[PDB]
Design a protein around this ligand. Structure first.
Ligand SMILES: Nc1ncnc2c1ncn2[C@@H]1O[C@H](COP(=O)(O)O)[C@@H](O)[C@H]1O
Ligand SMILES: Nc1ncnc2c1ncn2[C@@H]1O[C@H](COP(=O)(O)O)[C@@H](O)[C@H]1O
Ligand SMILES: N[C@@H](CCCC[NH3+])C(=O)O
Ligand SMILES: N[C@@H](CCCC[NH3+])C(=O)O
Ligand code: NA
Lengths: 506, 505
RNA sequence: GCCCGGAUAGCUCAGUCGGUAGAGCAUCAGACUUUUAAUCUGAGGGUCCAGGGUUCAAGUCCCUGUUCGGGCGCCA
């Protein structure tokens, strides 16, 4: 059964292990990386042989071309770079050792090559080995798939196979790590302090998002995973540390979409004695420097519908577009929206429903004032911001978790940074009034409470912290994955996730 | 009184809100930070008054000393920086505003001061206020004590109170951040790649512990919480990324005590084409650099229990002590230790049992050959590592994820760094053999079925990844919290944790 | 939670009505001392995701189920 490669390879390796041959050596002394080898010994003329120079390199064989019984060509691939290995028995230790070592090497094997650098007569950089050492054989078949692997299921289930075959995934992960490093550097230079808040809190709190209930055996009580570190950061700000940040993981037991994952990484910082107006400039510097540093140009090309789909050229020039959504929505709808003062009344709800019907906007059967307005915004506002765009104060009906506007009435102070019709940043001015916060929590607990349950959906511990006095601060949150998607021309969150969640094959 | 104080202050704040004035202004543009203010204006000689520059600063009042009715001294508190505000009626906006602003400010309230820097004849830096704005009143009565809340319970349950009354806690967190920041940069400049492995998996893997069980609604199934990212790191190394590292959280479903938490942070890295003796230098250099960069010197004084008991003086001199484990235990053990390199059968468990019983060592009912050996080593050879020390060449049955010793038999190519009689970081040589790994997993699963509870399962995907070929690598792990305790002179894991888990009571 | 799509030899794809399923890559054995998707000569291989049905007859026609790729919902 020649096709049954796994059984044959396993038998061969078992025979090697039995017959006094170790196919898993403990240590191989690598002297130079493949990248440095390519960068250094590139000036050689074709048909050169640096006999005096001897180095050691290691990598995975990706091809085994046999031009004869004494000349076999290998293709080491490591560090995302490739190096040919022209194996000539004349330059080997001995003919018998040459045959013995070439009878075991197959595609996908990991070897340690010790030989002189050189170039072939066709001007291809290679290394003429003096002793090939088998490091870790590959038992399963490695497919010679051109244009790389293109099956989503195998690419996401077997990430190692995707990294071995495809080469751009390594670039994607490298770019994500740089993004994280750049955010850390910027925030640390601004004077912020990195913190590690608990990820397993004690009570659900007032969060419409479904939590991840977890049972603690010793405590004999349920624990809920962290949805957002908002409360702990603000309790730290009360303590005296006026600038904190944390790039951690969030857990939301919700659905999975192209841009939504149950577990995701976000960066959240809180700075005292500031506001969202003071934060748009910081966000501008953040994003502009990120795009300029990770890439080489402020302009980024994005494909929201795959490589064959429509291409969009976003521009990250630092002066991002700022729009107040009330005026922009009025202009788009071409009508005078009710004054923000009446927004809590029923006639504004009625008239907004009239806009939804007239302008052909869909909405679920529940049609509260915040949600249909959010629908109008989705189809008449963000749908046009290919470039980064700041949306200014939003109606208080959206989210009352922000302070009242200084000049405008009934307008929460917030902004959302929209890129490619998707929000990446979101910052608020902070409510530091204990009474208003208590009323908000009470309302959230009443909404979240399934029955006559209270406190469980509130954070009295936090409500006590605000009673001690919190300075006027401003929060800020960015989705790391939602930015890595745009900076890597990725339209799916699973492409930037290292090991995406997959149901068992069974 | 605290209830009366809260009621009175709440009524006063409500009255203030009613009468137009808002005690919670939206914004206050602070011109200069308190530390920068102090550093810039400390050069002044006593007695001057720079009536030319107006600066706006903010902080929390810590004391309100009264000297008559025409002079009130405030005491702002910044990031461990104290500035004294002396409010003078003559230099204020007006007398009426002076009275109206001094009749509403109490201890603990957050205020914003705008005015001219100065210094009285005594010689302390002050800012003469032109107007004082109340930003956030403190309704509760802040405890005024000359020592700072000493009740660890309150210190832990209410960390904001601890930070307000105690500054050392703030620095403890600064050092912790420095430790993590240094480690990331050290691996970064070595060429490592930072990764974010999943926190929820089908089954736990990477270490041996009791996991947390959750439920997923979208994918209807039970998902266990992360115990160690080891397996995913090894799959990544199989993929082609030679060097990886990750500083993230791990979860254990064990009891909560003075030195254990449900959630903790660990640093794990994996580099290919190396071995456990290659990390012997990297780990030593990283620890020595951490100690020198954070403390400022290579010697650290640590109090194992309380700041008044014995104070052992450790020394992080880069040539760390290196000894073997089995051989040193043989030397330490009064009686002869069985060869046990090829001996791991009932006889070895029997001899370890009689040794354990004879040495008055008590071990959990399993008394596993491994559970016996680790207890014996930890009770006899473990307590000599005041200075950092490497303990290498462990027996095979202790760790099921380490390659067999190139020379020694039935011994794992692993070492442990022990400082202050505690484990801070250990590293093995990764076992890339798929058949041997599958056997080890099968024995682990058999033990779990028989009488074990926190042992691991079979991970078929990891076995397939090993079948695809894993280069010779060496992993390395480190508990951040233990090093934070050692470098900040803390005997409790609660001290180095911002909001440590406590019994609900 | 609701709809639209698939699954074929180790793997990348063909397969017309319902009248077995084919080709390349890869694998194995050979020849070739300058190849690079090396070339040439030989050899294997499957019930077509899993079940029921429908039929004289099913990869094809239909139902359910597993698991992926999408859309609307959820994430105030
Ligand atoms: N489920 C999710 N999947 C991916 N990114 C998310 C998810 N939820 C939130 N984000 C990102 O996190 C950012 C801040 O979210 P929030 O802190 O809830 O305002 C958003 O703007 C998104 O970029
Ligand atoms: N139950 C636990 N709670 C908190 N920290 C723990 C617990 N178990 C182990 N640790 C930490 O894990 C460290 C060892 O990590 P490592 O050397 O990577 O195995 C210890 O020094 C502790 O700080
Ligand atoms: N942490 C929030 C911002 C502050 C929340 C309360 N104003 C976020 O990331 O969206
Ligand atoms: N993190 C591992 C040890 C270090 C990494 C070895 N692969 C553990 O403690 O379980
Ligand atoms: Na052929």
């Amino acid at each position: 059964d020649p096709n049954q490669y796994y059984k044959i390879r396993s038998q061969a390796i078992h025979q090697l292990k039995v017959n006094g041959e170790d196919p898993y050596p403990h240590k191989f002394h690598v002297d130079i990386s493949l990248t440095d080898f390519i960068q250094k010994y590139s000036h050689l003329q074709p048909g050169d042989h640096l006999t005096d120079i001897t180095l050691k390199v290691a990598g995975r064989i990706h091809a085994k071309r046999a031009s004869g019984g004494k000349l076999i060509f290998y293709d080491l691939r490591g560090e995302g770079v490739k190096l040919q290995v022209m194996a000539n028995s004349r330059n080997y230790k001995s003919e018998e050792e040459f045959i013995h070592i070439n009878n075991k090497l197959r595609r996908g094997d990991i070897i340690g090559v010790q030989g002189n650098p050189g170039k072939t007569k066709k001007g291809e950089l290679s290394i003429i080995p003096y002793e090939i050492t088998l490091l870790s054989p590959c038992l399963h078949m490695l497919p010679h798939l051109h244009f790389g692997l293109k099956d989503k299921e195998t690419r996401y289930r077997q990430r190692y196979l995707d990294l071995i075959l495809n080469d751009f995934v390594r670039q994607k992960f490298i770019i994500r790590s740089k993004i994280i490093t750049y955010i850390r550097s910027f925030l640390d230079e601004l004077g912020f302090l990195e913190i590690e808040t608990p990820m397993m809190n004690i009570i659900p709190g007032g969060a419409v998002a479904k939590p991840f209930i977890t049972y603690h055996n010793e405590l004999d009580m349920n624990l809920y995973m962290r949805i957002a570190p908002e409360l702990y950061h603000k309790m730290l700000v009360v303590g005296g540390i006026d600038r904190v940040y944390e790039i951690g993981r969030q857990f939301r037991n919700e659905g999975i979409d192209l841009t939504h994952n149950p577990e995701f990484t976000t960066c959240e910082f809180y700075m005292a004695y500031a506001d969202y107006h003071d934060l748009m400039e910081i966000t501008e510097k953040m994003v502009s420097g990120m795009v300029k540093h990770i890439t080489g140009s402020y302009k980024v090309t994005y494909h929201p519908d795959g490589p064959e789909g429509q291409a969009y050229d976003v521009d990250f020039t630092p002066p991002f577009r700022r729009i107040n959504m009330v005026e922009e929505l009025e202009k788009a709808l071409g009508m005078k929206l009710p004054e923000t003062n009446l927004f809590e009344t029923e006639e504004t709800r009625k008239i907004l429903d009239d806009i939804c019907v007239a302008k052909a906007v869909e909405c679920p059967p529940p049609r509260t004032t915040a949600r249909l307005l959010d629908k109008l915004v989705g189809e008449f506002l963000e749908v046009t911001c290919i470039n980064p765009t700041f949306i200014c104060d939003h109606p208080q009906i959206m989210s009352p978790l922000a302070k009242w506007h200084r000049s405008k009435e009934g307008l929460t102070e917030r902004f959302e940074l929209f890129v490619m019709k998707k929000e990446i940043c979101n910052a608020y001015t902070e409510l530091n009034d204990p009474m208003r916060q208590r009323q908000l929590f009470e309302e959230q607990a009443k909404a979240k409470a399934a029955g006559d349950d209270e406190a469980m959906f509130i954070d009295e511990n936090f409500c006590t912290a605000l009673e001690y006095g919190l300075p006027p601060t401003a929060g800020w949150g960015m989705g790391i994955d939602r930015v890595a998607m745009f900076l890597t021309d990725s339209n799916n969150i699973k492409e930037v996730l290292l090991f995406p969640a997959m149901k068992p094959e069974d």
